[PDB]
Nucleic acid binder design. Structure first.
Ligand SMILES: [Mg+2]
Ligand SMILES: [Mg+2]
Ligand SMILES: [Mg+2]
Ligand SMILES: [Mg+2]
Ligand SMILES: [Mg+2]
Ligand SMILES: [Mg+2]
Ligand SMILES: [Mg+2]
Ligand SMILES: [Mg+2]
Ligand SMILES: [Mg+2]
Ligand SMILES: [Mg+2]
Ligand SMILES: [Mg+2]
Ligand SMILES: [Mg+2]
Ligand SMILES: [Mg+2]
Ligand SMILES: [Mg+2]
Ligand SMILES: [Mg+2]
Ligand SMILES: [Mg+2]
Ligand SMILES: [Mg+2]
Ligand SMILES: [Mg+2]
Ligand SMILES: [Mg+2]
Ligand SMILES: [Mg+2]
Ligand SMILES: [Mg+2]
Ligand SMILES: [Mg+2]
Ligand SMILES: [Mg+2]
Ligand SMILES: [Mg+2]
Ligand SMILES: [Mg+2]
Ligand SMILES: [Mg+2]
Ligand SMILES: [Mg+2]
Ligand SMILES: [Mg+2]
Lengths: 207, 257, 153
RNA sequence: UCUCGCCCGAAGCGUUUACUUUGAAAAAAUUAGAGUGUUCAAAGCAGGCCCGAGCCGCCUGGAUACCGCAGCUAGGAAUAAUGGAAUAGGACCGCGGUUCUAUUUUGUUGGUUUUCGGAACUGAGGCCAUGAUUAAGAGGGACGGCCGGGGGCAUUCGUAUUG
RNA sequence: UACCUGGUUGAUCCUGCCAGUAGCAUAUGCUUGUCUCAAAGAUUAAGCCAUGCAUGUCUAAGUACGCACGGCCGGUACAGUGAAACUGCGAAUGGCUCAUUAAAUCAGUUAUGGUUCCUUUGGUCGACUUGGAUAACUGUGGUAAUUCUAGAGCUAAUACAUGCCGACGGGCGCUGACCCCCUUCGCGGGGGGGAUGCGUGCAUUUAUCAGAUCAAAACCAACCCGGGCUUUGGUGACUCUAGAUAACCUCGGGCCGAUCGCACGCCCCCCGUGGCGGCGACGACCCAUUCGAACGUCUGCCCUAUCAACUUUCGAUGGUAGUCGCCGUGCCUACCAUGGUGACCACGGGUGACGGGGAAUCAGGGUUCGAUUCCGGAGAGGGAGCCUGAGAAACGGCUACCACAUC
RNA sequence: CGGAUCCGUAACUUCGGGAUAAGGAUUGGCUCUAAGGGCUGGCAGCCGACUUAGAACUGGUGCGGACCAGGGGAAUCCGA
RNA sequence: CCUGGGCAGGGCGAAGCCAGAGGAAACUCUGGUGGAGGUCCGUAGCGGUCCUGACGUGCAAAUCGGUCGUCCGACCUGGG
């Protein structure tokens, strides 16, 4: 019986409006679903007009888009930090439209190896992971093309994203509503937004 | 109320249906079709009230499912199927090809045309868009959505349509010097050459039109139907040019008898 | 600068400019929208600094419907001001008029500086921004007196 | 203004109303009102004709007027208030310097520069008949010869009453 | 019909009210021959209801082994009428009343680019038939009875599900074995082809890229021809529509016929055991129109100051993000600012106040009603919550409370 | 009832009061968060006190846990 | 009369002072600050309302236990 109506409100001045409706059907209100970080669990909601709404009660997998290089892979959701609207929902770990998700940087490493060779995040050992790092041997002139992609374009993912990849986590902003479409779809924080949310999380951990 | 309306009152009926006060309580409400309720004419009104074919409406309801009356090629099973301006009504046995043109009084005037012109039909473009795989779609005011129309069609045009094939032909642009016919408002049924359009940024523009023997009027873009091409109407219109002279000239006509 | 949690309307920030290494100007990636209607976009929306979701030149606020005019009365409300529309009312019985006015809150975009009290401002209808704000500041016309003179201190 | 195809169209466009005259504007019923012998009329939108049934037929009506106030468009400039130039930070014309952006062309692609179209700022002079309607038997203020039991403070005189 | 008359005084003139005058609409007294129309439980009691009805529906075209009737009728399932039940649509319309409601509903005018939309009308719709279950039916029961129902057997489809062939494989993105030419001792450099493998179409959810008004050269490095060539649409406007890029496509799972009827002919051919299949009822992913809803924008409402400041901890005003909702919204949440309205009557009260088109009243200007047949709103004793469904907080739908009230 | 915190407080009146009027909610433990300061250099860096507010978790509704400690209201007579 | 000694903490918040707001003026309103009083709860101190409690040949020829009134003063008290 949740009513999002405006006829029970006050006027421009603040005069109490006289009630005469009975909270009709075309002004529905459904209770909130705090989207946890458990397994994938989505229920259905009937919509006025015969449509279907996918209510995500808790989610595990997610979809996130890298910003600059225009790539997108699947990503397991790890942790919820800095809601920036309600800090209680950080501890509640509720997925909303504008929130920050820790991307596991492992599904981006295969694409970064396959297109942007001589990768990073390999613990400065240079002995481990016989991945096919140097097995394919880069026979034809696509080796020179990858040299253009690696040195002429120069592939700079400099010190902020460097330290994030060397810590094995990535800071992502959600760009979709989890309670509406059932998808925790988002993008990767880059540059000015990256240093801004990094400063906010660093201040939250410091003071 | 709740949901859509379903009845219609004779008192709340529109004026251009020629309904009575003593006959019945409920008016024939037309079904959902290509035309709105204010610019339509039911088949039960067309066959019962106007042409005097059946006295009751039950006879019309019987014959429309006895599969005689067809609109634009296909047979209508509904007794209250809505029609509109510039439609072809033919029933299958004699020469009866009624064109729904507008009278000078604003009423649906019958016009028995020959078969060679009854094969063809004009229609006004409502809007134009693009869709799946980048193809052009055209929406007609007669609820006709056609793909790959032409690239040289402005939104406010009148294109000839073939009822046998569903193909458009012989478009004409909205230009000064075209013969148009006003379909809506207080000056409907007015046939005149387009004289001057005036644009306004407030989502509505005005058009001043002129016609023969020194007369001029003005209307809005949502009520204009182009009918001609340089003082040459593609469809022959009954009772002269459809000109409203004067109520006193109508009295002089009735005295001349 | 910014003093909120996030301000980024539509434009993607990084053009991956790190190819030689340089700071450069960062005010070039700015969204620029023309409202049409024969009204000129001010240069504050061109070379400004602000980020406004409800600006008609920056946000997705479409301008439609009616165009009215009023006079600016107050400033104390944040990023939106209150206008006054003085008008007369024809009365059939007594056969003369009377003064009536209805104050409305209107969204003042931060690009319009020199918004001093007493100037004739133009407003336009938009989508409902908030509970009382429905119009949008569209053109500031009057200088609200003589700006040439100056006072002591 | 001829950039848009010696004139026109288009576009710069109103400083913003009040007031007026057209035009669209809406929904019928109702009101005024056209026509019609419902036996007149209240009504209603009907009916009128030719034909000895044999023309497997015609013609016409179901209009118009009003619809305050509110909103839109096109003229009018009389009355009623508002904008200009006073510490000039005034309007035009063509020249100095600083700075930015987009696309036409060097047969095509990549790099540098100029002219060009425009925006912003600064410096110097000319061009304006270079800029203030005169002062209401309106009002405010100043002057100076008065005016009056106007008001406040202090002082003096007068007879009478009582003791 | 632009209309007065009598009444204060011994008499006259004046202000002044009272009373006669005429409609209008409620009741009532008396009387009443014809005929055409015609309002009618509004005023008090939106108080209570016995009884009887007001919502059902089948086509040649979804499902016929009904025990009912008959076709001639022999047998290779099935033809005809067909009660009843499974299925779909409608019962969110109509009718009734005006109890609440004072910029609230409404009325004039504008728009959803900020939404949904049954049903019709158009575009789109690129394995010789698969599995459980069940109603009607038959037996079998319960209590005093309801539109009460479980238990045993079986049966059907447009019930609910599972799920296939075609169709050549085109083109593109990324890897990619291999291969051609020139130069160089080689290394290397430059230009041009290319077998495998992974992704494809429309919608859903992201992020990114390129996208229209305008005309002259001067230098350096690469290449086509005989000094010289390359481009989606609309609005007043877009974060509009449409392309391309990488991936998700959600088990409560978007679509890409595991339908039915008609009249029936023809052909390649080795039998047809295969095609040539024409018309017509169902929505099916989406896009428009049509019917309708919704919050919106400007203007307009009776009386009252013995109603002068009102709103703000249970948002009052605004901003920043988020939740919910179909969408824009203090509709809700966290933080921040202290705002917003008013003597041009704010706020609070009363209305024997539903708002209008209209009705009565005959100079003009006005005054009083409008519950009532047409539009819109509200409600089904009060008031709250909800299933189904596109559309309801429905009441001739359901659940709980109060007041009634039946067996 | 009794302490403390946050709302709200009538009749009357000498306008000071009545008033801790009356009447409601919370009170424990353990974690955090925010705010309130000092001293040095031409905004940055070092050093400490007990207060307030908000939030989460949890204990058998238990929290002034002992002790500390106003029952209240309507009136009449008399004396300020 | 002279001469000395003493009176824990809290509540109410007077004059004066500061800042802000309304108004044309007269003037009004709001938040602090201040610490006033034969002022309120209350300890020590001083008296003794009630239980007519305990004793009542008692501890005492007038005392004790609760419940008390007042406690910055018209306050209590030593010595001369
Ligand atoms: Mg710490
Ligand atoms: Mg109804
Ligand atoms: Mg003298
Ligand atoms: Mg008299
Ligand atoms: Mg009288
Ligand atoms: Mg809140
Ligand atoms: Mg009422
Ligand atoms: Mg009259
Ligand atoms: Mg009148
Ligand atoms: Mg409605
Ligand atoms: Mg409404
Ligand atoms: Mg209802
Ligand atoms: Mg009903
Ligand atoms: Mg009933
Ligand atoms: Mg009392
Ligand atoms: Mg007391
Ligand atoms: Mg007494
Ligand atoms: Mg005493
Ligand atoms: Mg005292
Ligand atoms: Mg006391
Ligand atoms: Mg006491
Ligand atoms: Mg004693
Ligand atoms: Mg004692
Ligand atoms: Mg005793
Ligand atoms: Mg004893
Ligand atoms: Mg005591
Ligand atoms: Mg005591
Ligand atoms: Mg005391």
């Amino acid at each position: 019986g949740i009513s999002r109506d405006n006829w029970h409100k006050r006027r421009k001045t603040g005069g109490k409006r006289k009630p005469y409706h009975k909270k009709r059907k075309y002004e529905l209100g459904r209770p909130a679903a705090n989207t946890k970080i458990g397994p994938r669990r989505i229920h259905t909601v009937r919509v006025r007009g015969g449509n279907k709404k996918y209510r995500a009660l808790r989610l595990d997998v997610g979809n996130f888009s890298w910003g600059s290089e225009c790539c997108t892979r699947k990503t397991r959701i790890i942790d919820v930090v800095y809601n920036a609207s309600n800090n209680e929902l950080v501890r509640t770990k509720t997925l909303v439209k504008n929130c920050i998700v820790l991307i596991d940087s492992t599904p981006y490493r295969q694409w970064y190896e396959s297109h942007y060779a001589l990768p990073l995040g390999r613990k400065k050992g240079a002995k481990l992971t016989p991945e096919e790092e140097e097995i394919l041997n880069k026979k034809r002139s696509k080796k020179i093309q990858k040299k253009y992609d690696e040195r002429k374009k120069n592939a700079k993912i400099s010190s902020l994203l460097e330290e994030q990849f060397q810590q094995g986590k990535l800071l992502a902003c959600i760009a979709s509503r989890p309670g509406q479409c059932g998808r925790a779809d988002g993008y990767v924080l880059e540059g000015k937004e990256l240093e801004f949310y990094l400063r906010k999380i660093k201040a939250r951990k410091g003071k | 109320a709740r949901g859509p309306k379903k009845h219609l009152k004779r008192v709340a009926a529109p004026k251009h249906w020629m309904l009575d006060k003593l006959t019945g309580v409920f008016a024939p409400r037309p079904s959902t079709g290509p035309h709105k309720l204010r610019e339509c004419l039911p088949l039960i009104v067309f066959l019962r009230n106007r042409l005097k074919y059946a006295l009751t409406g039950d006879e019309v309801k019987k014959i429309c499912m006895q599969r005689f009356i067809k609109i634009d090629g296909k047979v209508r099973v509904d007794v209250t199927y809505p029609a509109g301006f510039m439609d072809v009504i033919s029933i299958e046995k004699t020469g009866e090809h009624f064109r729904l043109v507008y009278d000078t009084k604003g009423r649906f005037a019958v016009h028995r045309i020959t078969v060679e012109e009854a094969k063809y039909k004009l229609c006004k473009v409502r809007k134009i868009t693009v869709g799946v795989k980048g193809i052009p779609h055209l929406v007609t005011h007669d609820a006709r959505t056609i793909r790959y129309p032409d690239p040289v069609i402005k939104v406010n045009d009148t294109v000839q349509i073939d009822l046998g094939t569903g193909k458009i032909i012989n478009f004409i642009k909205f230009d000064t010097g075209n013969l148009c016919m006003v379909i809506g408002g207080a000056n409907l049924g007015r046939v005149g050459v387009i004289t001057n359009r005036e644009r306004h940024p407030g989502s509505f523009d005005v058009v001043h039109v002129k016609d023969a023997n020194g007369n001029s009027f003005a209307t809005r873009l949502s009520n204009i139907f182009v009918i001609g091409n340089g003082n040459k109407p593609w469809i022959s219109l009954p009772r002269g040019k459809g000109i409203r002279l004067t109520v006193a000239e109508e009295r002089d006509k009735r005295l001349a008898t | 600068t910014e003093r909120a949690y996030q301000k980024q309307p539509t434009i993607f920030q990084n053009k991956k400019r790190v190819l030689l290494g340089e700071t450069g100007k960062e005010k070039l990636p700015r969204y620029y929208k023309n409202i049409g209607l024969g009204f000129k976009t001010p240069k504050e929306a061109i070379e400004g600094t602000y980020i406004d979701k409800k600006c008609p030149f920056t946000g997705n606020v479409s301008i439609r419907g009616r165009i009215l005019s009023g006079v600016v009365t107050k400033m104390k409300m944040q990023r939106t001001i209150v206008i006054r529309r003085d008008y007369l009312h024809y009365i059939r019985k007594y056969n003369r008029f009377e003064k009536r006015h209805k104050n409305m809150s209107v969204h003042l975009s931060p690009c319009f500086r020199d918004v001093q009290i007493g100037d004739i401002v133009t407003v336009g209808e938009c989508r409902p921004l908030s509970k009382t704000v429905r119009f949008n500041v569209l053109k500031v016309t009057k200088a609200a007196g003589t700006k040439k003179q100056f006072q002591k201190f």
